[model samples]
Target: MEKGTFTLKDIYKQIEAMNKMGPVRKIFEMLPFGLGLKVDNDVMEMTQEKMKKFRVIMDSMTEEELLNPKIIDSSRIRRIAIGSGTSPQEVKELLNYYKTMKNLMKKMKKNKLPI
Candidate 1:
């Protein structure tokens, strides 16, 4: 927490400084809450359907869009699903998962970190 409000890119840079390399996605999610993300069990599991839907949902979004999903609503969901070749239900599930994380972050933000 020395440098507050960091992003995944900050972590990738740190890893590179230490001469380590891996796909950023693996580490990026770990950035939030400093190690454990605390997502729900069914949300975190690796079923084929979940993985596939996750990929498509991400593929359908720009990085800005990914970070700022609060701007999105049902119309955006429809568009995302159409572009991803998945149903709206699939897109909504991922969005709902994101909302879960976002809610935790909101709470953390409101409360501030315990020093």
Candidate 2:
């Protein structure tokens, strides 16, 4: 595959695989926005570990704290940006992506509400 290019078939295959995951089998299954943020943090942690960078910012946080939406405001984002050597804007964008997914997931669940 090219560095930044993906064929339609590639996407189709990926979607097909995702669809096979029973918990997320529904076409309307929502991808929480926080998922992206969590993924980013996980990646960053791995990168730091690989680079031998001590003291991961995420390590300083509890799992509950890390996943808490209310604590992800601008100040917290700035702190993460500084610690991760990433731009606050980039962090915010990632967080927004996660939030959108969360909202969509909620919508999907609500759509299946009991009568």
Candidate 3:
């Protein structure tokens, strides 16, 4: 966690069968500040309200969109909300979260990707 510390490229390599989306998601995800958990199996979880709205928004996105969230634009947000039976604000919230996560990775040196 220093100025130039970084991970090896191979860290992002895929490994299925685990209940996770690998490091790609963490790089794009926002765990927020707090969430009470079992502390054992509870790795992460979004709030019920956000997840309810976010589920539809994310569910409507194509696999490519999820993988490369930067591709999401205004038109896509509008379309995603309509198609997902949600509002534009809901889509924008996720977009905001993605932006925050992406920017933090760019700013910080210790970005933990999956293995």
Clashes of each: 0, 8, 0
TM-score of candidate 3 versus the correct structure, residues matched by position: 0.42
lDDT of 1 by residue, 1-115 (tens): 3233543223223323332346666665444445354644465534344444455455565555554555566777787777876767875665576467777865675646678
Candidate 2 lDDT tens digits, 1-115:
1332232222223333322335555667577665555555544434433212212333432344444544656666666667756556754554465577677775675556577
Which residue pairs clash within candidate 1?
A: none
If scored against the real structure, what TM-score would every candidate get? 0.42, 0.35, 0.42
User: What TM-score number comes out for model 1?
Assistant: 0.42
Clashing pairs for model 2 are: 31-101, 32-101, 32-102, 33-98, 33-99, 33-101, 33-102, 34-98
State the displacement of the C-alpha of residue 74, model 1, in Å, after optimal TM-score superposition.
Answer: 2.3
- Candidate with the larger TM-score of 2 and 3: 3
* Candidate 3 C-alpha lDDT tens digits along 1-115: 2122222111122221233445754475566566566453455643444444444444566655555555557787687778877767876665575467688866687747877
RMSD of 1: 14.3
